[model samples]
Target: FETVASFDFRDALSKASTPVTVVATNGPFGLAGLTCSAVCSVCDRPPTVLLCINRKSYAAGIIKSNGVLSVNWLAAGQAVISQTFAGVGSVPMEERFADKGWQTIATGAPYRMDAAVSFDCTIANIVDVGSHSVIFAEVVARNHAEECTPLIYHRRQYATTRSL
Candidate 1:
């Protein structure tokens, strides 16, 4: 069962051309946002989504406490935004947002004002997986731009939509 499950996950991830990014919620303090390389939507009917977060990450604790989150689908060419929020070396979270503008979503988690699209969610279930927590959320609201291509991640690198 474990082997099959692992391989299934690997296959699914291998087929993924883009990564998911979300802003996890915390109690007060500004907000600790994160861009995870792992996330997926499980169902089309009723709209269900899932994301994995390392237990040690600040965003994980925030999501656990608040039970809500906001996810941003950044426009293509937004690599700088991703790098800033992802943090390099020992950079602080507040400093990360200095270069990017943001706005509070329904969950109070900040969303990049320049994102191509955004989704607001209410956590429906949380499963403790080894070293990480798998959170499933119900989509509450969504915003999308008229003309934008999403930023994509593949093979540990950021990619922008090519104009052909």
Candidate 2:
């Protein structure tokens, strides 16, 4: 059996559309957030979610210390929010979280009030995988809005979902 090449593997995944989220954390670790695309649901019985963060990211350390995180599911036209968190233009940390759309909820973590959906969770478990941490969190609160298009990233660009 032959192992897949890393570039090819990454290129293949690049074709897969993934939801864009601004994952935020607050509390004793202060405030921090970052754009992440590797979030998923691990199960339903416990209302758990899984999000991956790079070990080197500043926000990752805050989240680990804070023990709580919020997943803000980006909606269409929220690309700027994503960009802000992604440090796309090398913006300051102070400039990243100042929007009027931010709201603190169950975990004391700020979520995007304008998000299509926001999930607040407490850290349940974390596993190190290569250069990233696979964080499993138990959701304590969530909010959703109807009739909205979700923002997605595919092939190195932003896109949106549409119903048939």
Candidate 3:
């Protein structure tokens, strides 16, 4: 009964759609990147955003020590990049950043060169909540690309928005 209830809860949460992003950072934490769907805008006055990462995620400690990160919002056709960063298929870390378009902005974090949008941020605060840490950051720089569709994740699948 417990197992069945847990699966039901997970399935219910998976129905929601979320934007996909690759969170990247560099510095003493070394180069790190991972696919994240738990990002959202917190406030606009200071251009703040919050991203949640599991405490055990490979990038969690790196992000904490680096003190900065870039949120690279993926486009509809960039699922391969997302999968690589997500550690799918056991891809090596070096190969993930190699042969990929990347650049650094004000915060010195690696931003995807072809991301639909990128937010370079400096960590402001972090709070541990359950099995995840909520990262609050102040946006230091940003870029947006026109004529692109954002990648979406829903129900353990990928999707994109379309006009009616």
Candidate 4:
């Protein structure tokens, strides 16, 4: 047995493309962004997506009690949104939505309507990690904004696709 366990994140990070910013919201009460390397379709039967969120995040409570979450895909040049949600911009939770441009659909939570796409989901399952919770949600509603490049995070910086 090894005294300490070390995992190679290179393989995982390598597989992740310039990160796609996902903004998850739980009604009008909570919203946050997570830098995810994992999110995918589980099956075609009902259509589903899996999300991993730190249990400590405010959204966790909303997801746990409400069993609903909205995922907003950020559009290019919206790096500010990602930075805002990540709390790096020092924007308060409630004040964040003060950006009048935020809009809501099925759920009342404010989401950037200008995003590339948005998925509204209902929680199907939940798993606990050391300090996080993995939620498997089946998509129930969807919306897509006009075709636009996506804002991405890679190697600790923000970037967009190279121009053709």
Report the number of the highest-lDDT candidate: 2
Q: For model 1, how does the per-residue alpha-carbon lDDT over 97-118 read when each residue is reduced to its tens digit? A: 5545566667776656667777
lDDT string, candidate 4, 1-164, tens digits: 74343345654565467556554665544554444535666886788878777788775776666677767777786777777777786776667666655666775544556778777777899988767688888777778778778777666667778778
Number of the top candidate by TM-score? 2
RMSD of 3: 2.4
Clashes of 3: 0
lDDT per residue (tens digit) for residues 38-69 in model 3: 99999998999999999797788888899999
Which 10 successive residues of model 4 have the least lDDT summed? 2-11
Q: What C-alpha lDDT does candidate 1 achieve relative to the native structure?
A: 0.72
Q: Per-residue alpha-carbon lDDT of model 2 for 1-164, expressed as tens digits? A: 99899899999999888999989999987889999999999999899999999989889999999999999899988898888899989888756777688888898998777799999999999999989999999999998766558889999999897777
Mark the regions of model 2 whose C-alpha exceeds 4 Å error after superposition: none
Q: What is the TM-score of each candidate against the true structure?
A: 0.78, 0.94, 0.92, 0.79
RMSD of 2: 1.3
- Compute the lDDT for candidate 4: 0.68
**Which of 1 and 4 is ahead in lDDT?**
1
Query: How are the candidates ranked when ordered by lDDT, highest leading?
Result: 2, 3, 1, 4
